[PDB]
Amino acid sequence: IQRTPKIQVYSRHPAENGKSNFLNCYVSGFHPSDIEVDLLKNGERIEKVEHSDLSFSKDWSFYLLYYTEFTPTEKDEYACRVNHVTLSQPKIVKWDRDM
Amino acid sequence: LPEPLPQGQLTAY
């Protein structure tokens, strides 16, 4: 069978507007490993997003971390868009500095 | 260090 990914969008350091930080999108618990992940800034795909090397957990499910540099602000909206064979359409998860 | 290869042919599944 197939397992749908769990998704968490958060920053490396506590969010401080005007201060450089790192935006992370952690996808995990999914099986087959093919997965599409983009980080969005106000709905637009950020370009130089990197990710960790494919690895997996004891239950065989895969996990990957996607990240990019980024400067938090008062109105700029950030989110993570993920698509997987288990998903009917891309799933959007907005960044909540309190999550 | 990962598991070294055998002297002969690596056994497939």
Binding site: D53 | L1, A12
Partner: protein, 276 residues
């Protein structure tokens, strides 16, 4: 006083899109230190932790030979398993293997591991005795017979009890400043009203290593296990991890709640409460 080394192999077929991809990554505890990807422009083992960079050319070429050979062999294995399950040549399939050694605080193999899965389901594993196999089904039984005839278990045991432990101890010494350094979590409790008479108390643990941690909410000294939302520990990207646990409490009763944090890097377990 606790350490392990693990290698994770993932081989994925993709009919119509080339030969199966083989990826291997190596970890010491929660720190990745090497990688290999058959899809790379120039497939070679690459360092992923600073302390492994000091290894010389022979180490890297030895690693690369191992992974390049595994790449070809796991393409045969995918073909074989497809046959064992009477599956069509049209589907994509995955074989995963994870193996390694566990050390106690007083060196020597504590336990060895070797497990493989097909399409996410357990397929075959080496038993704790490092001499016998446990096959999931009649298909895995074919692999078992092949491996017994090729003395696979005996070779794996020799590696797990020998080189695996030796190299793990070497890595632990070379990277002792990080691998043997437990960073305690920075903690704090946040309060988020959810209605006129209910509020969310969230206990945060940030910047810790290793990933192992215990975060629990107690009400009057009683665990609120069934009422706690506990998120999966996640990587910060700088080697450390983050985690939180939240509970919805009746407004005005926040002091009846305590967050308890246990982690190797802390001088003593922590007990936190919301501080207005």
């Amino acid at each position: 006083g606790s350490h392990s080394m693990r290698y994770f192999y993932t081989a994925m077929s993709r009919p119509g899109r080339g030969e199966p991809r083989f990826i291997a990554v190596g970890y010491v505890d929660d720190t990745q230190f090497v990688r290999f990807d058959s899809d790379a422009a120039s497939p070679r083992t690459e360092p992923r932790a600073p302390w492994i960079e000091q290894e010389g050319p022979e180490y890297w070429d030895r690693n690369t030979q191992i992974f390049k050979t595994n790449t070809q062999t796991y393409r045969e294995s995918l073909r074989n398993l497809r046959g064992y399950y009477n599956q069509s040549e049209a589907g994509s399939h995955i074989i995963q293997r994870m193996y390694g050694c566990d050390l106690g605080p007083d060196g020597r193999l504590l336990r060895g591991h070797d497990q493989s899965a097909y399409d996410g389901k357990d397929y075959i594993a080496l038993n704790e005795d490092l001499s016998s196999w446990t096959a999931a089904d009649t298909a895995a039984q074919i692999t078992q017979r092949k491996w017994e005839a090729a003395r696979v278990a005996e070779q794996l045991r020799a590696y797990l009890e020998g080189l695996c432990v030796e190299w793990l101890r070497r890595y632990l010494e070379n990277g002792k400043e990080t691998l043997q350094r437990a960073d305690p979590p920075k903690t704090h409790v946040t309060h988020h009203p959810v209605s006129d008479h209910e509020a969310t108390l969230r206990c945060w643990a940030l910047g810790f290593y290793p990933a192992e941690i215990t975060l629990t909410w107690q009400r009057d000294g009683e665990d609120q296990t069934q009422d706690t939302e506990l998120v999966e520990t996640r990587p910060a990207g700088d080697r450390t991890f983050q985690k939180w646990a939240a509970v919805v409490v009746p407004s005005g009763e926040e002091q009846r709640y305590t967050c308890h944090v246990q982690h190797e890097g802390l001088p003593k377990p922590l007990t936190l409460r919301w501080e207005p």
